């Protein structure tokens, strides 16, 4: 499973599809018409040495119900230059982005351990998106 975390979001829960249940692998999450400034937040119970991440949106039957113009940000516990240029003014590093509804990648190990993952919606969208896979892989 995923590292134990408190999860939260500015997107209103639709018909009991809680983000908690999605982070526990039980159900999907409806993200209805995301707006610029919306966020999805995963705050790990303890800092996590993260190897890689995978977020999937859309599904069979609803293949268009994907997250658009959303980034993947990580908040290191502590405060390469290539990764340095990805720093945002709030301390997060903007390391990933959704495309075709999928965001996947590696964490620069210089960032570890991570205290939070944040998905940031950058632009308005008319889609009723389905976030159906959240995978954060610990380092071994």
Author numbering: 381 to 459, 465 to 525
From the paper:
N-Acetylglucosaminyltransferase-IVa (GnT-IVa, also designated as MGAT4A) forms a β1-4 GlcNAc branch on the α1-3 mannose arm in N-glycans. Downregulation or loss of GnT-IVa causes diabetic phenotypes by dysregulating glucose transporter-2 in pancreatic β-cells. In this study, by combining bioinformatic, biochemical, NMR, molecular dynamics, and crystallographic analyses, we discovered that the GnT-IVa enzyme has a unique lectin domain at its C-terminus, which is critical for its enzymatic reaction. Comprehensive glycan binding assay using 157 glycans and solution NMR reveal that the GnT-IVa lectin domain selectively interacts with the product N-glycans having a β1-4 GlcNAc branch.
Because we could not obtain diffraction-quality crystals of the wild-type lectin domain despite repeated trials, we introduced an alanine mutation at D445, which corresponds to D877 in NagH and is supposed to directly interact with GlcNAc residue. The D445A mutant was successfully purified from bacterial cells and showed no retardation in gel filtration analysis, indicating that the aspartate at position 445 of GnT-IVa also plays a critical role in the sugar binding, as observed in NagH. We successfully obtained well-diffracted crystals of D445A mutant and determined the crystal structure in unliganded form at 1.95 Å resolution. The overall structure of GnT-IVa lectin domain adopts a β-sandwich fold composed of nine β-strands with three short α-helices. Six molecules exist in the asymmetric unit of this crystal. A DALI search revealed that the 3D structure of the GnT-IVa lectin domain shows high structural similarity to those of NagH [PDB code: 2W1U30,] and IFT25/27 complex [PDB code: 2YC431,]. As predicted from sequence analysis, the structural comparison with NagH GlcNAc-containing disaccharide (GlcNAcβ1-3GalNAc) complex demonstrated that amino acid residues that directly interact with the GlcNAc at the non-reducing end in NagH are completely conserved in the GnT-IVa lectin domain. Four residues (Y819, W836, D877, and W935) are completely conserved in GnT-IVa (Y394, W410, D445, and W513). The position of D445A is slightly buried and there is no water molecule corresponding to the hydroxyl group of GlcNAc around D445A. The activity of D445A was reduced to ~62% of that of the wild type, indicating that the glycan binding ability of the lectin domain is required for the efficient enzymatic process.
